[PDB]
Design a binder for this molecule. Structure first.
Ligand SMILES: Cc1cc2nc3c(=O)[nH]c(=O)nc-3n(C[C@H](O)[C@H](O)[C@H](O)COP(=O)(O)OP(=O)(O)OC[C@H]3O[C@@H](n4cnc5c(N)ncnc54)[C@H](O)[C@@H]3O)c2cc1C
Ligand SMILES: Cc1cc2nc3c(=O)[nH]c(=O)nc-3n(C[C@H](O)[C@H](O)[C@H](O)COP(=O)(O)OP(=O)(O)OC[C@H]3O[C@@H](n4cnc5c(N)ncnc54)[C@H](O)[C@@H]3O)c2cc1C
Ligand SMILES: *[C@@H]1O[C@H](CO)[C@@H](O[C@@H]2O[C@H](CO)[C@@H](O)[C@H](O)[C@H]2NC(C)=O)[C@H](O)[C@H]1NC(C)=O
Ligand SMILES: *[C@@H]1O[C@H](CO)[C@@H](O[C@@H]2O[C@H](CO)[C@@H](O)[C@H](O)[C@H]2NC(C)=O)[C@H](O)[C@H]1NC(C)=O
Lengths: 459, 462
């Protein structure tokens, strides 16, 4: 059968690969951008390539092998380092000058961890129907016996680092049942390894794709005509007999099936018109799940003024304004001598920030850094890079997040095809939504679902 | 039967009243503070009594009579004014000065409203168990077809105005099914009347209390020994045989039943120890519901620099930072010539703000005001009042908000009695949680459940 795959991100390439492996090779991969990889995408910043999107292989060293790890660590040997968050207590900056007492912070972290652990126990007891699910915030109130969760600046930044920095939305909107504990870590291990390779984390996608798409023997570039870049799908027309897909450049294509890999955000946006309209159950499932945004703001300085050394990689800024430029990273290992800092924000801050100029953001950041390093002569960042994923119509966000209110059945409706319209992507990952490995496995499962239906008529 | 009622806010006074009415007069109302009224409470600010807490009779002029209205507007004749929000479109300030074009704003309002109305239709269809509920935000995304709800400064303050300003938590945390549409408005009417009377909205509570508790003929002060103020209940021991209640000043009382009217926030804070501990199902119901915080920041100025006149009472600041000092009210009618402004914040901002000095807050607000009225010489507020309800142990917030995640059954468990321990309060209002009328009605309802057990020996609840 001919299958059109919309999008050449991890899941699209992964799905096409799986299809090809089932022998469905009459594929047409339509990618909106001029490159493949989607959310795994590097860029030159300050003479170095940094990841605008995914940057870690998360869930390593556990009881099950994270499928991406071997590709990263062995097959491609992409340069990488395990992140050590053990020294956070030594790196929590007071809103107005210097770090807090490490012991004080370590206890706050401990309480936080302890609470989450109790949340994990509780989570295990909830009913599969999700009927007793609650937001993580609700669990925190319950375990701490307070009418609120973390509310002091230190508690909040700890909270933000523990949750928002992972999920990109606050605990209060987050489904406890579906995030605590998280399969990714529960299955693959608690370690996470930061990929810092000039080839880019995206090399993983390119590798997969080269396993079945044609590439130039010298160039190495993919030249397979089954991959068409700069093809923005804008319409997918389907019937019991097949589908037609129209691209922004006005090309029109036909196939027996279409595998949609565009992000949940893209699906929530109307960039693609389905005709007929997706059924209500589908639409509701789509709109009920969350497409989070996680913005990696890179900054380059004329000189270092922050600490480097053991436990220095990650540091938090305990602003009284929850989530305000709170999580920082310095790359003494990754990009030795670059004088680059990375501050991450999400959700509301991400949308506010994407909406203002880089200069304005730089200026806000300079004020924070100055407040952070009052003793130093903090030079103004020479360059800043503000990824605008939510604003990018081909992503409209960085990764899904599971909100309280959505249960599994409904999450699964996300994965459900509609007639000949199949879906794949991290937000369709049965247990790894939000990750590269989730996009990866999702391409596989989605393809297998189409394969059984299409090849064995077992739908 | 002797009944101890914990708390003399609206629900406790209302409950005790209903009990008294069913002939249960062997009552003891233990009030933590030196006064009754709880969340209905005024205070002198810069020479005028403004309300720290409830300020409106919400839901007026509808198909059904808000029980609170007649007392306020007729029995007591408390001074009050219908809030008119029809001119908001002319009153939305730009983060960086002046107001937005009215037509532009009106359109955004109309969109917001239309999404909401579409949400009301969806809501009607949701399974009554609450099992298909979703957040208001989800409904917004669905209807706007965006991966986010309002996200520009203007749509956001409009959204905040429409929701956070009513519920004190964001749409994304709020149960659609339980708040859109809102019964208070559907049943009692869309209007709201702001009480601006030196006697305070709490007069309603003093009035009811007075219907059954003894008062001094000249002072009119309640002098009934059944009301004991400054009695903070710290422990409630209950058994098949009865209940014992202990106050912080070591007083110990015994009764057949106890009726707890303390806020959800108090319940979530362990101020009162129950012995035996409440059942897990109860505990969970308690923690899952939300106790919101709504902070009425009053500011006093040496002179007026904002507009007054038609449609001027309410104005919004379209901050690019959602919920940042966004909803303003000027008191040309309520406190004429006082030069007071009220900016309302809730939730995260409330918590942040309660935790820092009023001076710091005032300075934040001054910068906002100067950005809003760059053409004026905005004088620094000479006075500011930041109500700290979340920090107050007898309240731990302002009012409950039904969050996405609490289902019908869970909410009922929140209300359910445990043995001889009954619960009441706005957070136990079946359809009016979060309101004065909900507290009022909840008092009567819990009283009735208690009356059936006590008088009709009908003790099984749901
Ligand atoms: C900032 C950020 C941080 C993250 N952190 C990490 C991390 O450290 N570790 C981790 O494991 N995961 C992380 N993730 C999550 C991970 O990157 C994603 O889950 C994964 O790459 C999603 O791949 P996917 O194929 O589902 O979607 P995508 O990568 O979005 O692929 C979808 C593709 O469809 C294309 N497309 C969209 N619309 C159209 C259209 N109309 N027509 C045609 N093509 C279209 C897009 O251009 C894209 O190439 C991060 C992501 C981001 C963005
Ligand atoms: C800032 C704010 C704004 C609001 N806006 C409005 C509005 O405009 N309109 C509206 O309808 N509603 C509004 N509400 C909600 C309304 O005021 C409340 O719903 C209602 O007053 C609550 O009454 P209650 O009896 O349920 O609780 P409360 O008024 O809290 O009564 C509980 C009583 O118990 C006391 N107590 C607590 N702990 C103990 C203890 N351990 N022992 C003894 N006594 C104890 C408390 O002191 C209090 O007196 C607002 C409330 C606040 C605070
Ligand atoms: C990631 O890959 C490196 C690459 O080899 C691993 O380090 C090697 O592990 C083998 C296994 O016994 C040793 O014999 C080699 O001497 C090691 N090489 C180096 C350079 O140390 C490493 O353990 C891998 N990490 C994970 C998490 O799998
Ligand atoms: C609030 O109360 C006032 C007090 O009566 C109401 O105004 C009275 O309404 C009757 C009804 O027609 C008139 O005959 C009186 O002349 C009115 N009095 C005044 C002073 O105008 C008023 O309508 C009430 N408002 C609401 C919303 O109930």
């Amino acid at each position: 059968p001919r299958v059109i795959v919309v999008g050449a991100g991890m899941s699209g390439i992964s799905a096409a690969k799986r299809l090809s492996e089932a022998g469905i090779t009459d594929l047409l991969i339509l990618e909106a951008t001029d490159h493949i990889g989607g959310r795994m995408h590097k860029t030159n910043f300050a003479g170095i390539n940094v990841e605008l999107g995914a940057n870690w292989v998360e869930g390593v060293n556990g009881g099950k092998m994270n499928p991406i790890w071997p590709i990263v660590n062995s097959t491609l040997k992409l340069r990488n380092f395990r992140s050590d968050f053990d020294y956070l207590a030594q790196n929590v900056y007071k809103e107005d000058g210097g770090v807090y007492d490490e012991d004080y912070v370590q206890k706050r972290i401990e309480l936080a961890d302890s609470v989450e652990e109790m949340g994990e126990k509780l989570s295990a007891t909830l009913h599969a129907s999700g009927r007793d699910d609650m937001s993580i915030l609700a669990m925190q109130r319950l375990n701490e016996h307070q009418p609120n969760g973390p509310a002091t600046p230190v508690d909040m930044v700890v909270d933000y680092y523990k949750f928002d920095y992972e999920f990109a939305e606050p605990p209060r909107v987050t489904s406890l049942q579906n995030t605590v504990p998280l399969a990714t870590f529960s299955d693959f291990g608690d370690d996470v390894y930061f990929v810092a390779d000039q080839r880019g984390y995206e090399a993983v996608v390119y590798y997969l794709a080269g396993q079945y798409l044609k590439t130039d023997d010298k160039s190495g570039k993919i030249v397979d005509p089954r991959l068409q870049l700069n093809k923005v799908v804008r319409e997918i027309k389907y019937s019991p007999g097949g589908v037609t897909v129209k691209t922004e450049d006005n090309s029109v294509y036909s196939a027996d099936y279409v595998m949609v890999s565009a992000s949940l955000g893209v699906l929530q946006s109307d960039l693609i018109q389905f005709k007929p309209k997706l059924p209500t159950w589908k639409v509701r499932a789509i709109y009920q799940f969350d497409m989070a945004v996680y913005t990696k703001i890179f900054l380059k300085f004329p000189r270092k003024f922050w600490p480097e050394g053991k436990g220095r990689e990650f540091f938090l800024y305990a602003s009284s304004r929850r989530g305000y430029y709170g999580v920082w990273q310095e790359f003494e290992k990754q990009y030795p001598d670059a004088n680059v800092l990375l501050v991450t924000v999400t959700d509301e801050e991400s949308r506010r920030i994407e909406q203002q100029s880089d200069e304005q953001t730089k200026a806000e950041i300079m004020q924070v850094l100055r407040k952070m390093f009052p003793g130093k002569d903090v030079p103004d960042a020479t360059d800043i890079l503000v990824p605008r994923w939510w604003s990018d119509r081909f992503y409209k966000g960085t990764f899904s997040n599971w909100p309280v209110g959505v249960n599994r059945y409904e999450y699964d409706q996300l994965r459900a095809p509609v007639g000949r319209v199949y879906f794949t992507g991290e937000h369709t990952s049965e247990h790894y939504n939000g990750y590269v490995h989730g996009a990866y496995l999702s391409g596989i499962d989605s393809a297998e679902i189409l394969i059984n239906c299409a090849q064995k008529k077992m739908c």
